[PDB]
Design a protein around this ligand. Structure first.
Ligand SMILES: NC(=O)c1ccc[n+]([C@@H]2O[C@H](COP(=O)([O-])OP(=O)(O)OC[C@H]3O[C@@H](n4cnc5c(N)ncnc54)[C@H](O)[C@@H]3O)[C@@H](O)[C@H]2O)c1
Ligand SMILES: NC(=O)c1ccc[n+]([C@@H]2O[C@H](COP(=O)([O-])OP(=O)(O)OC[C@H]3O[C@@H](n4cnc5c(N)ncnc54)[C@H](O)[C@@H]3O)[C@@H](O)[C@H]2O)c1
Ligand SMILES: Oc1cc(Cl)ccc1Oc1ccc(Cl)cc1Cl
Ligand SMILES: Oc1cc(Cl)ccc1Oc1ccc(Cl)cc1Cl
Lengths: 257, 257
């Protein structure tokens, strides 16, 4: 596999429907050694379950809200992987009330802070903590969404956090490049997952992003997975600070009936 | 002037070097009635003087770091301007220990939060507090910077803040558009302002631009004011959710020597 010999930390796996699960699955297939993290005691068991299916016995607890949680996690990974080759950041959050109805009315100072902290700061918080642990040629990857570029209904505050995320990607990519680290993000299209139920009326939202989509179908965790495996391999050595769209061309088209 | 019969609130005036000053100066020239706010009593004095020169005796204390502060200000203003037509958002801040050196190294959860809070959320918080006081045809304007589209040295976390700011302009314009409110932004080039001297090596980044810029000179507060005046008048009734570059064309060039 074009990923053999690589050691990648995968986060955000919560179910077989999780985009991260599709990513881990595709990387394992390409020969990568994986390491997983779970947010809390509620998810641990299931993460270990999937971790086992992928020949991995490295399951660490990690809540990006707590800097100390992040330092303890990496201080632990360091006991088996003194050095690894990057990680996948697949984490987002915002209280439900932030994603419903008018944006100006729903958004609050508190909701704003949580969405940006958990969805955009955590990405660099993790890079800072494991900086010296990364081998040259390592790659860091995160997941964004079209709402960062266009204003989408009900997505509201997340759109601003995602915009911030993509900017984070470019600043991280620029600062860490001389060390041999690349940073990119995949801006995936609508995919029915667990949290995907958060946005109001998402069932009919994915139906819209099908007929108007160039390839005439929404993407799967497999599609994002293959692209994520590519962006974290040595085959994409010339790509850094890029936001590649994996939405079947949905964004590059307009008024498709 | 093309702004006659308009009540506009102007924030950010800390000195005649302030971009906000260039903006108020041009609007007043166009016959627009202005209102003014100040961060702390340490500035109340100057602001009252400048306000008097522009035929305005409305100077309120407003600190966007506080919900109540924004509430009180719009309460006080409501006494004189039960209804007005928009405001100019010229506010940004991040602790110095965030604007100097490697981004991944300088950035802190605290620094990230404050930046995004004061420089991006403040813009939509102000719109929540005065949403009902806006006349149809109202216009809201904020100031951004190229750092939100590209990784620029030392600008660090502010870049993420400014990116958050621009998506904010898009979501606001899409939410308030049906009420008759337009939301835009100006992305200004480097200007020697009162806070400009705060960025690591600025007078150096200023000399560079005025050499690689198409119009072969950096912009002035008047250039920004004039575009600001236009973006808030009915003369641009067709623009909304747009980020117009007022930097002499710097962003659209590359490799000039
Ligand atoms: N589902 C989509 O259609 C879609 C589209 C574009 C981008 N994304 C992004 O993909 C990523 C994953 O989302 P998903 O669709 O796989 O949903 P998901 O529910 O399968 O996984 C989300 C994960 O976030 C984790 N998480 C939330 N808060 C956390 C915290 N404080 N600390 C550690 N982990 C935390 C969850 O525990 C969970 O694993 C997100 O960035 C998301 O926004 C999803
Ligand atoms: N100077 C530039 O080259 C440049 C380029 C692009 C954009 N901008 C933007 O222009 C805007 C104004 O910056 P400036 O160059 O005129 O500097 P400035 O020092 O003249 O004004 C900055 C203002 O921010 C206000 N402010 C800070 N925190 C505040 C708070 N908590 N509550 C209320 N007001 C607060 C200050 O009091 C001050 O008036 C910013 O958004 C800035 O980023 C500046
Ligand atoms: O970013 C996303 C984009 C889409 Cl189209 C669908 C789901 C997404 O993911 C989330 C949305 C809201 C919350 Cl609270 C948490 C997550 Cl993981
Ligand atoms: O955004 C800016 C861009 C440039 Cl080129 C010069 C000055 C700028 O403005 C600021 C930068 C940092 C802080 Cl703390 C506050 C402000 Cl007002």
């Amino acid at each position: 596999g074009f990923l053999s010999g690589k050691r990648i930390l995968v986060t955000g796996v919560a179910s077989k429907l999780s985009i991260a699960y599709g990513i881990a699955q595709a990387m394992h297939r390409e020969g990568a050694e994986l390491a997983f993290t779970y947010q809390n005691d509620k998810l641990k068991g299931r993460v270990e379950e999937f971790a086992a299916q992928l020949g991995s016995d490295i399951v660490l607890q990690c809540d990006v809200a707590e800097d100390a949680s992040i330092d303890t996690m990496f201080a632990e990974l360091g006991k088996v992987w003194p050095k690894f080759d990057g990680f996948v950041h697949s984490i987002s959050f915002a209280p439900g009330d932030q994603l419903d109805g008018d944006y100006v009315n729903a958004v609050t100072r508190e909701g704003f802070k949580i969405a940006h902290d958990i969805s955009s700061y955590s990405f660099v918080a993790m890079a800072k903590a494991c900086r010296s642990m990364l081998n040259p040629g390592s790659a860091l990857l995160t997941l964004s969404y079209l709402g960062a570029e266009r204003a989408i209904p009900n997505y509201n505050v997340m759109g601003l956090a995602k915009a911030s995320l993509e900017a984070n990607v470019r600043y991280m990519a620029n600062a860490m490049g001389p060390e041999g680290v690349r940073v990119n993000a995949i801006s995936a299209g609508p995919i029915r997952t667990l949290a995907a139920s958060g946005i109001k009326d998402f069932r009919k939202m994915l139906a819209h992003c099908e007929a108007v989509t160039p390839i005439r179908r929404t993407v799967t965790i497999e599609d994002v997975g293959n692209s994520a495996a590519f962006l974290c391999s040595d085959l994409s050595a010339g790509i850094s600070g890029e936001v590649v769209h994996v939405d079947g061309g949905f964004s590059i088209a307009a008024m498709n009936e």
